[PDB]
Structures are given as structure tokens and as C-alpha cells.
Design an enzyme around this catalytic site. Structure first.
Site, PDB file in Angstrom:
ATOM      1  N   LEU B  64       0.808  -1.222   0.000  1.00  0.00           N
ATOM      2  CA  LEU B  64       0.000   0.000   0.000  1.00  0.00           C
ATOM      3  C   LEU B  64       0.842   1.273   0.000  1.00  0.00           C
ATOM      4  O   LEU B  64       1.985   1.251   0.455  1.00  0.00           O
ATOM      5  CB  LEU B  64      -0.975  -0.018   1.184  1.00  0.00           C
ATOM      6  CG  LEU B  64      -1.949  -1.198   1.128  1.00  0.00           C
ATOM      7  CD1 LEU B  64      -2.385  -1.630   2.510  1.00  0.00           C
ATOM      8  CD2 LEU B  64      -3.142  -0.922   0.209  1.00  0.00           C
ATOM      9  N   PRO B  65       0.272   2.390  -0.506  1.00  0.00           N
ATOM     10  CA  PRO B  65       1.022   3.633  -0.717  1.00  0.00           C
ATOM     11  C   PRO B  65       1.346   4.413   0.549  1.00  0.00           C
ATOM     12  O   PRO B  65       2.301   5.189   0.552  1.00  0.00           O
ATOM     13  CB  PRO B  65       0.084   4.478  -1.596  1.00  0.00           C
ATOM     14  CG  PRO B  65      -1.079   3.602  -1.937  1.00  0.00           C
ATOM     15  CD  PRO B  65      -1.139   2.540  -0.902  1.00  0.00           C
ATOM     16  N   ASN B  69      -3.528   3.989   4.512  1.00  0.00           N
ATOM     17  CA  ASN B  69      -4.035   2.880   3.700  1.00  0.00           C
ATOM     18  C   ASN B  69      -3.677   1.523   4.300  1.00  0.00           C
ATOM     19  O   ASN B  69      -4.477   0.594   4.265  1.00  0.00           O
ATOM     20  CB  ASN B  69      -3.519   2.983   2.261  1.00  0.00           C
ATOM     21  CG  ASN B  69      -3.948   4.277   1.565  1.00  0.00           C
ATOM     22  OD1 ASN B  69      -3.341   4.686   0.570  1.00  0.00           O
ATOM     23  ND2 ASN B  69      -4.990   4.927   2.085  1.00  0.00           N
ATOM     24  N   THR B  95       5.875   0.812   2.623  1.00  0.00           N
ATOM     25  CA  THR B  95       6.829   1.591   3.384  1.00  0.00           C
ATOM     26  C   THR B  95       6.076   2.580   4.268  1.00  0.00           C
ATOM     27  O   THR B  95       5.428   3.515   3.781  1.00  0.00           O
ATOM     28  CB  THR B  95       7.831   2.268   2.465  1.00  0.00           C
ATOM     29  OG1 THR B  95       8.514   1.250   1.736  1.00  0.00           O
ATOM     30  CG2 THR B  95       8.839   3.095   3.259  1.00  0.00           C
ATOM     31  N   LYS B 170      15.160   0.574   5.623  1.00  0.00           N
ATOM     32  CA  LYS B 170      14.814   1.211   4.369  1.00  0.00           C
ATOM     33  C   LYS B 170      14.782   2.737   4.452  1.00  0.00           C
ATOM     34  O   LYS B 170      15.281   3.417   3.556  1.00  0.00           O
ATOM     35  CB  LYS B 170      13.514   0.614   3.810  1.00  0.00           C
ATOM     36  CG  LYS B 170      12.699   1.552   2.983  1.00  0.00           C
ATOM     37  CD  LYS B 170      12.446   1.012   1.623  1.00  0.00           C
ATOM     38  CE  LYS B 170      11.912   2.107   0.737  1.00  0.00           C
ATOM     39  NZ  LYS B 170      10.720   1.679  -0.023  1.00  0.00           N
ATOM     40  N   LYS B 245       8.136  11.542   0.615  1.00  0.00           N
ATOM     41  CA  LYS B 245       7.368  10.717   1.545  1.00  0.00           C
ATOM     42  C   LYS B 245       8.321   9.994   2.505  1.00  0.00           C
ATOM     43  O   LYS B 245       8.207  10.110   3.731  1.00  0.00           O
ATOM     44  CB  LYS B 245       6.521   9.692   0.783  1.00  0.00           C
ATOM     45  CG  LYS B 245       5.691   8.771   1.692  1.00  0.00           C
ATOM     46  CD  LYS B 245       5.472   7.413   1.059  1.00  0.00           C
ATOM     47  CE  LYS B 245       5.251   6.333   2.099  1.00  0.00           C
ATOM     48  NZ  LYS B 245       5.222   4.975   1.459  1.00  0.00           N
TER      49      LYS B 245
END
EC number: 1.1.1.31
Lengths: 294, 296
Positions: B64-65, B69, B95, B170, B245
């Protein structure tokens, strides 16, 4: 065919020695007579001034700590230019302002001689082994001649363009180095504070898009790599004072050329801060120790 | 034995396809029904909610973005958690904030299931070829099981520690990338304005202490390297929106863990400015273009 050498500090000394290993007779000067005694004891000619070096040598290497020392060695009262002969090759391996290199070049040209900037990257280890990188600016006709000399002291000799381009390349490299080293320190510290094993995160950085020389060759976190200053309480290596000097040159050039350097400015101020906080004599990778909270 | 897949965007779609290439039956959901039609036409079961996925699959991957979400897919009214069976393996490749991954894990655990965070690095090319890196947090007893699934979609699958450590790894990598990409852009631009040929300066950086992935694999200056977005007006690659983001996440985590990020903060605000100035759909290496003096 003797070569002149001016400036025998922690870099000049091993550089001069590598020329002797290649069979070059040397004509020596340093403002500190004690730094010359070693070479005099071994059959090299020690003289009293940079002018006196130029009087006896048609190829000279200058290796000086600062812009001011460099201009003094060339344009001073007893500087090279007072006695420089026509057709002489002058190579300045000092790290100085690109604009100063250009000004110096114009002056040696008036004397019918040739100037080239050839600042080095590598440090005392590379200086001793002859594995330095020379970044060379000047008239390209003269590069081949210069490379003959510099190749005895370094493993890579790169033509960068006109005078000052050597200084420019070196300054830009070190600015990016500082940004990435601080970046690495910041990312490693955040990672650890997030509960990651530093060795694991270094492994991830070094197999990913975060990979850089700082993280894979010179990691600032103690215990991650052997054989780097962080393994040894940041002793030796490339001094924080020296990094700050180089970033001062980057900053001055960025203002002069009106180039925006958001991260580079901040890197500069950070290493400036570290100079005032007891890091001046520690390797620059000590920024991790500056950032981390025990 | 079916695997659930929730979220079929530019990453989810090729990921799910690689599972099918390995013989896995799939139970599919995406909020966009149009993104599901492709998989329905090929014999995969499309359902109406994430809960309905959990009702039929004991292993689920979510892609998912956003943080919002992600929690809706799990904790929502028709989220996984409503119909998740005991012993279920749930892997979130979104992420998101490490702290949110932890919260989700605690909720999943109440239902007697297992949660692991497995965010990906590599982008749509690596997603397609199956050359993604998975950075995996969670109970290590479960890693081997997860690796069997993820290995179908990625070439590297790395265990990072407890839940949230995959997100952590990450986020730290991408912060260091942002810093170094901006750095490369700044050093290149300064070099060029000092009179250096960019190709020469790249060469010098790439053989010296300044060499990074940004400078030697993804150079931001047009004409220096082939096959990178800067050769192609910064089309495709890794979007500026996405970089911003990820830096937002680093910023928030840095605040939360009280970690000083002087350059990481500025990298974040710089990419933020780019998003508001027309760069959001360009590859993040367009920072060079952002720094460059425009004719007037």
C-alpha cells in the site's frame, strides 16, 4: 636533472622520498630547518630559500599548508619568482583557492615560466606508498611533462583542464565527501537509535542506493570496519581541521560563483563546530561521535 | 494453498505476477476494481474486501502507498483483522512508519497471527524482474517461511531484526541516498560553475572518496551516464513525491527517537519544495535541475 621540493610536512616528506626512490636528485627548502636535516644527511642539496631552489632546478614541486604560505613561496621577498628561469615547470600540490592558482599562474607567466596546480588526495599513507591522486590544471601541452614527475609520487594523475581546475575538482570531491560522511553518520546513528545492529545497517547501506565510499570504505561507526580511524578512536587519518579548511574553500568558491550549496554549507558549519569542540585533531569521520548520544 | 495480495499498484501488480510465476494461487483485493480485472481474467480469485482475503488465505501480502491505507487494510471495518485465521502469516511490504508496523503487529498478535514488515527497495524495474530487496522485521522463527514467499519477488531478502526494523533500514538507506544525491548535484553544479567538464568531474568523484551510488550509478547530470533518468529528462525512475514521503518518515522517526539529522532534515525540506514546484512526477535525481540556474 635535479627536482626542487619546497615544503616537507607530513605530506611533503614522503612525497620527496618517493622521488628519491625513482632516482631524482633533489633541491630542498622548508621554513623549518629541522625538517630538512633528514634529507641533507642523505646527499640531497638543502638551500636557504625557494628562490635558491629555482636557481638550481628547472622543475619544482611546492607542497604548502595554506593559500598564504603558497603565495609567499612564489611571490614573497625570497619567493620562487625572484630567481625563476625561463621555461621552468612549477607545480603546486598545495590545496588552495582556484582563483589564487590562476593569479599565481599569471605571475609565473610574466616570468616566462609555466604554472600548474596539482593538489593531492590520499593522505600520508598514499603519500608514502606513492598511491596519491593528482588533479592537474594548466596548459595541456605541459601535462605530459608534469605527469613524468607526478607519476613518481602518485598512482593516478588526471588532467582537469586549465589552471585552477585541479583545485576545483579536489574542492568539489571533498565537499561531497563531507556531505556523505555526515550523511552516513546521521543514517547510522538514526538506525542504531531505531534499534538496528550497526553492522547489519552498514551491510544494507553497502548493497543499496545509499552505498558510498564513507559507508563501504571508511565507516565512521566503531566496530563496523577494521583498518579505519573509527576502529582506533579516530586517531590519524584525515584531520577535522583539514576537512574544515577544504570546506572553507568550497564555501568561498560557492559564494564567488553564486552556486547554491545547502548541504555543503551545513557540512562546513558542522565541521567548524567540531573544531571548537575538541575534534580538531581527530579524523573527520569522528562526526559520528559528535552526533551520537552515549 | 492460496496467498492473499492486497494493493496492486505499479509495485503490487508485478509482485503478484511473480508469485503466480512460482505457482501460487492468489486471492486479490484492490480498492480500484479496474486494477483487479487483469488478475480475474487469468484465474485468480478477486474478493470484495481485505477481510474477505483473510477469510480465504492464511498468508497475505499487503502493498500500500501510505501509513493510513496500510492501517485501514488491517484495522479497517473490512480489514484483514476481521477474518484473519490463527497461525496466519501477514507481510506488509508497504513503506510506513516503524512505530505503525509495531502497532499493527500487536493487533495481529491478539488474533493469534504473525506480522512482519518487509518494505522493498528497487522500483518498478526490479519489481518486474524480481530483483527487489526485501528488508524484513519480525520474529526470526518466521523469517525462513517469509523468505520462501519474498524470494519469488526479490533477489535479496534480509532479516533486519524485530518488527519495524525493516522499515527502519529502508528509511535510513533512503535518507542517506537523498543526502548523497543532493550532495552530488551540489558538487557537480559547483564544479560546472567553476569551469570543469562534468564528465571529467564525475570520473574524478567516481575514483575518489566522493564516490557514491548517486554519482557512479545514477548520475544527476544529463550527458554523464546513459540509462539513468537524467539522460531522459528525469522521466520515470523513483518519483520526487516518493522520495519526499520517505524523508517525511525519516524526519518523524528522527524526532521520535530524538536523533539529530541536520542534513537529512534539509534533504527532506528540499524534496518537499521540489514537490510544490513541478518535480513531483520526475525522478528524484532532478534535484540537479532544481539547483541549476535558469536563463532569465
Amino acid at each position: 636533472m635535479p627536482v626542487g621540493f619546497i615544503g616537507l610536512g607530513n605530506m611533503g616528506n614522503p612525497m620527496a622520498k618517493n622521488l628519491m626512490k625513482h632516482g631524482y636528485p633533489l633541491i630542498i627548502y622548508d621554513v623549518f630547518p629541522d625538517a630538512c636535516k633528514e634529507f641533507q644527511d642523505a646527499g640531497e642539496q638543502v638551500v636557504s630559500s625557494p628562490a635558491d631552489v629555482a636557481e638550481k632546478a628547472d622543475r619544482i614541486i611546492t607542497m604548502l599548508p595554506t593559500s598564504i604560505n603558497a603565495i609567499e613561496a612564489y611571490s614573497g621577498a625570497n619567493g620562487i619568482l625572484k630567481k625563476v628561469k625561463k621555461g621552468s615547470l612549477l607545480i603546486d600540490s598545495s590545496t588552495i583557492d582556484p582563483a589564487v592558482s590562476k593569479e599565481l599562474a599569471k605571475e609565473v607567466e610574466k616570468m616566462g615560466a609555466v604554472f600548474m596546480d596539482a593538489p593531492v588526495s590520499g593522505g600520508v599513507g598514499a603519500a608514502r606508498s606513492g598511491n596519491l591522486t593528482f588533479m592537474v590544471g594548466g596548459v595541456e601541452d605541459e601535462f605530459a611533462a608534469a605527469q613524468e614527475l607526478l607519476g613518481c609520487m602518485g598512482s593516478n594523475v588526471v588532467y582537469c583542464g586549465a589552471v585552477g581546475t585541479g583545485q576545483a575538482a579536489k574542492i568539489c570531491n571533498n565537499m561531497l565527501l563531507a556531505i556523505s560522511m555526515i550523511g552516513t553518520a546521521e543514517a547510522m546513528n538514526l538506525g542504531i537509535r531505531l534499534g538496528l545492529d550497526p553492522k547489519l545497517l552498514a551491510k544494507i547501506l553497502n548493497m543499496s542506493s545509499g552505498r558510498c565510499w564513507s559507508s563501504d570504505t571508511y565507516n565512521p561507526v566503531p566496530g563496523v570496519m577494521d583498518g579505519v580511524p573509527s576502529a582506533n578512536n579516530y586517531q590519524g587519518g584525515f584531520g577535522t581541521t583539514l576537512m574544515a579548511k577544504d570546506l572553507g574553500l568550497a564555501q568561498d568558491s560557492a559564494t564567488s560563483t553564486k552556486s547554491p550549496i545547502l548541504l555543503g554549507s551545513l557540512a562546513h558549519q558542522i565541521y567548524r563546530m567540531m573544531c571548537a569542540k575538541g575534534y580538531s585533531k581527530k579524523d573527520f569521520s569522528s562526526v559520528f561521535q559528535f552526533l551520537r548520544e552515549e
